[PDB]
């Protein structure tokens, strides 16, 4: 065209930079970015042991052809919720709340206000939220202390383990204002082996295949 | 109590010294001055190549070169006349929230959630871009790297404090404390001897980069201040909240000159810039758009509407020849 | 009886061409260089839409004119133009259906290699292979001296009378292995999306989105293929056998199908619906 | 930065030879590479060019199709394979790096050169003399003229001033008109317009003597000047 | 005794202010936006030959 002898080489350099950009954006789009969240003193040095192994703290593991990056909550301190908009486009939000949350001493108002906050935030209300209730070492030994009238006025009856666990599930779906977009994946397991990685492999390949369907426009 | 009584009467009677000498509003004098109409600005260049949300952007000092920093861990230096990519720098951490250009075109500083302000050197002897100095020493996320010289840089952070560094040795030379929340933005003065900073406690404050002095404070919002810039003569500055208010404060009159909100606006301001004459206060918004406010009558004299996501960064050149805008849809668009 | 069909078929065909040209103009030029579109499925979709726009412009007003005169007045020029363009367009339309199905299968199931197998203009090379094979299908039987004016209220089309071997090659291995390809791709997609739901409207969308992209063009092409393979033994026998009314129904449902494909692939996408 | 070539020697005509340019100290996969030659006591003459990523390859019309250019990017080795060699291919061959973006210095570092000896439209740039005697402390002006106007429509005037001290390799001094190179002494200056181009050297020191050169970019092929030699 | 002392000392210097007011500096913004109106390529648009984009 009307380019000199150096502008053609500048354009060739820019096209090579475009080539490198999209060939690494391939890898940056084919990798599973999981945000990781949990309540205060829930236990997190027992599931980061389970995987195949300051500012933001990133944890890698490559499991079954999928490269999982996991960005933890244990790096930041500012709870002004100004670091959340950086975490859009994540595949799943691995939430971990256990049953021993009322040991360190009310969990109800703060937990349900945090969940109404993330159902108030426009970013987290359309992303899938994987839930873990992992162990079975102390989940049965502290329910039978008393009825739950001390901090939890939503329920005033008999408190067994799994019926109350289903009640926690049913009130957890009561927190959701709109299940039309987001989808919860709860897990009640024995945290003994790699059963804890097969509810962040399966429950994230479901989200991967749902995004692939709705990017085909198929379903 | 004694010192509480004295501080209460100090703030109230210094506000009374402000109010009793407060003459009139800005529009009360500039009402008879004619408007500028509809500044129909057109997209000339569209810069493509990013593959994620674009978080910040800084012009070169020669009105031709750009940096843009994106979420996929890429920093791109653009030739904005031929839409050519001069450089592409792979960052370490892809959580980059700000970026800056040196006023000599030599270095480029970029940082974010990993609490480390990296500073890269472009004019090397080897023909790549190596990391010159990683300024570490912040205990939380970083915002608004702003180069003073090739050896001196201001950085805001979420540690309620900003920091004037020294790129040669590498240590935090001056520390500016006084905020009560995450500090989201700063903007260097055109004479490069002052700066202002806006934080999440609904306040800005004017600091001196020489003495570490808390010279002035500035209130008036209800929410956090998301971005900031100076009037191009360095005697006023305009902030943009999530209140859907841009506000113009004077550094000497100690209060807000005038507010730049409209009732039809739903969402808050993400970026703020200025034209070279100080007439077009631009403002990127969270819906999709940019609005070009006439900075004396507060009337929207034009809307830059492309941008299929929320606008995140604005920049007007040193001569005023363009407006680069960047948004979460991975496209910087240049408007003239 | 030759009055009500003369009232209805022209309305059906002008409906087909009007909503076809508006939908295909939207589908082709509504692709944007901001590339929220522009993925390879959209490339095969706009190839299908221009392959239906080809029949929407060039031979369908001539078939409307053959209804308009009630006894066709034009000659060999419009005959060969209509019979070449219509055939190339419908074979390219069904082959772009096959390409859309295999692309969606290679995106859903085998997503490990999609970004290298499919790219910017590697998909263009695939669709030029599609155009190459529909040209190789539309050339030799249409210039071996077998394409002519069916005279009922009909037009200059492909009569299935002379070349029995190629009219067997058109019904099965040109217009019925799309059946197998589309059904295998969408059934593997459906059983995979129900297989990777391993946690222990429920059938509505989950089976209509398998049928609305497979069974509609299948059942709208299938009686015409039934007639074309039935007359392949001796077409002098089954022209007295098969009456003309269901022949009219069976061929104008294939005329409606070449707009139904654009209806499906341009108004049951959700990015296209929120793109308008 | 250390560019160093190998492959020189004596060859009889009709043969074919190969030169290598091993690079050590920079990102060779991000630089375009020129091959330049220089006949004995005559002057410089551009030979060939290969861009980054081996895409764009240009030659001089004297030996276009008679040489070939090869490149090894993850090994940093640049080859020139010459197929047939007459008694004009004998030269000192230099291997020059060149990066092209907005604001670069694209003839910056010249290799050490290698001797090759064979036994027995285009823009013309004219230099005024062949020997100028001068003492230190005297400001000297050199000038050269071009055929076309080198001032493109961009504003860039693609003229290059090099200096070759005796016994050494060349060295970029000025790369468009008024742009000093990387770490040259700032007593040099270049100016001119369109077709007339002058290099002014104030406060002339002792080691500033040597054969000066002016080159045009603007278009391929690249054409050097005749070569003004400052004398002392 | 010395925790809010630097705060009230900064407020003392925030009392000793070179107080140029909302109408003492109203005409300075008008003076800067008037006297540089010819240099702005967005307020007064440049002719399409001096536009580099
Ligand atoms: C045998 C099965 C059958 O009826 N098929 C439709 C025939 C289609 C539609 C019109 C036309 C025109 C030319 C042409 C073809 C056709 C196929 C080969 O070249």
Short mmCIF file of C-alpha atoms in Angstrom, two decimals, chain A residues 3 7 10-15 17-18 20-26 28-29 33 54-58 69 71 75-90 122-123, chain B residues 48-51 53 55 64 71-72 74 76 79 82-88 93-95 97 113-115 127 138-141 158-159 182 184 200-201 223-224 226 242 267 286 310 328:
data_model
loop_
_atom_site.label_atom_id
_atom_site.label_comp_id
_atom_site.label_asym_id
_atom_site.label_seq_id
_atom_site.Cartn_x
_atom_site.Cartn_y
_atom_site.Cartn_z
CA UNK A 3 3.60 1.92 3.57
CA UNK A 7 6.06 0.06 8.28
CA UNK A 10 6.26 -3.10 11.95
CA UNK A 11 2.99 -4.62 10.68
CA UNK A 12 4.65 -8.04 10.40
CA UNK A 13 5.84 -7.72 14.01
CA UNK A 14 2.31 -6.78 15.11
CA UNK A 15 0.84 -9.80 13.31
CA UNK A 17 2.44 -10.59 18.32
CA UNK A 18 -1.23 -11.33 17.48
CA UNK A 20 1.51 -15.41 20.01
CA UNK A 21 -1.38 -13.73 21.87
CA UNK A 22 -4.10 -16.00 20.54
CA UNK A 23 -1.98 -19.15 20.73
CA UNK A 24 -1.51 -18.54 24.45
CA UNK A 25 -5.12 -17.41 24.87
CA UNK A 26 -6.03 -20.93 23.74
CA UNK A 28 -5.65 -19.48 28.99
CA UNK A 29 -9.19 -20.43 27.92
CA UNK A 33 -9.95 -21.41 37.17
CA UNK A 54 1.61 -12.30 50.24
CA UNK A 55 -0.94 -11.51 47.55
CA UNK A 56 -3.20 -13.99 45.82
CA UNK A 57 -2.19 -17.57 46.60
CA UNK A 58 -2.50 -19.90 43.63
CA UNK A 69 -5.76 -23.46 39.04
CA UNK A 71 -7.10 -19.14 43.84
CA UNK A 75 -4.15 -14.26 50.89
CA UNK A 76 -6.32 -11.15 51.07
CA UNK A 77 -7.49 -9.27 54.15
CA UNK A 78 -9.70 -6.43 52.89
CA UNK A 79 -13.37 -7.45 53.19
CA UNK A 80 -14.61 -4.32 51.37
CA UNK A 81 -15.47 -6.73 48.48
CA UNK A 82 -13.36 -4.86 45.94
CA UNK A 83 -11.40 -7.94 44.83
CA UNK A 84 -14.47 -9.85 43.63
CA UNK A 85 -14.87 -8.29 40.16
CA UNK A 86 -11.43 -9.62 39.24
CA UNK A 87 -12.87 -13.13 39.72
CA UNK A 88 -15.42 -13.23 36.94
CA UNK A 89 -14.98 -15.82 34.25
CA UNK A 90 -14.02 -18.43 36.85
CA UNK A 122 -24.47 -9.37 40.05
CA UNK A 123 -21.25 -11.30 39.38
CA UNK B 48 -8.13 -5.78 19.16
CA UNK B 49 -5.94 -8.55 20.49
CA UNK B 50 -6.76 -8.83 24.17
CA UNK B 51 -8.71 -11.93 25.16
CA UNK B 53 -11.36 -7.87 30.45
CA UNK B 55 -8.55 -3.17 33.56
CA UNK B 64 1.03 7.91 20.00
CA UNK B 71 -7.10 -10.06 32.91
CA UNK B 72 -5.44 -12.83 30.87
CA UNK B 74 -0.97 -9.62 29.08
CA UNK B 76 0.28 -4.70 25.25
CA UNK B 79 1.16 2.12 18.19
CA UNK B 82 -1.42 2.31 12.65
CA UNK B 83 -3.09 0.03 15.29
CA UNK B 84 0.13 -1.95 15.57
CA UNK B 85 1.26 -3.78 18.68
CA UNK B 86 4.72 -2.50 19.54
CA UNK B 87 5.23 -4.86 22.50
CA UNK B 88 3.55 -7.75 24.31
CA UNK B 93 0.30 -12.87 37.93
CA UNK B 94 -2.74 -12.43 35.71
CA UNK B 95 -4.53 -10.41 38.42
CA UNK B 97 -5.55 -4.05 38.07
CA UNK B 113 -3.56 -8.56 43.53
CA UNK B 114 -0.11 -10.09 44.16
CA UNK B 115 0.91 -6.89 46.04
CA UNK B 127 15.65 -6.56 22.42
CA UNK B 138 2.70 -3.82 50.18
CA UNK B 139 0.41 -6.08 52.20
CA UNK B 140 -2.52 -6.05 49.78
CA UNK B 141 -3.71 -5.35 46.28
CA UNK B 158 -5.50 -1.56 49.61
CA UNK B 159 -3.30 -1.21 52.70
CA UNK B 182 -8.75 0.45 50.34
CA UNK B 184 -8.58 2.73 44.73
CA UNK B 200 -13.16 3.28 49.65
CA UNK B 201 -14.02 5.34 52.75
CA UNK B 223 -19.77 5.53 48.13
CA UNK B 224 -16.24 4.56 47.14
CA UNK B 226 -13.29 4.43 41.74
CA UNK B 242 -20.33 4.40 42.52
CA UNK B 267 -24.89 2.85 37.66
CA UNK B 286 -20.76 0.84 34.27
CA UNK B 310 -18.72 -1.95 31.11
CA UNK B 328 -14.44 -5.62 29.69
#
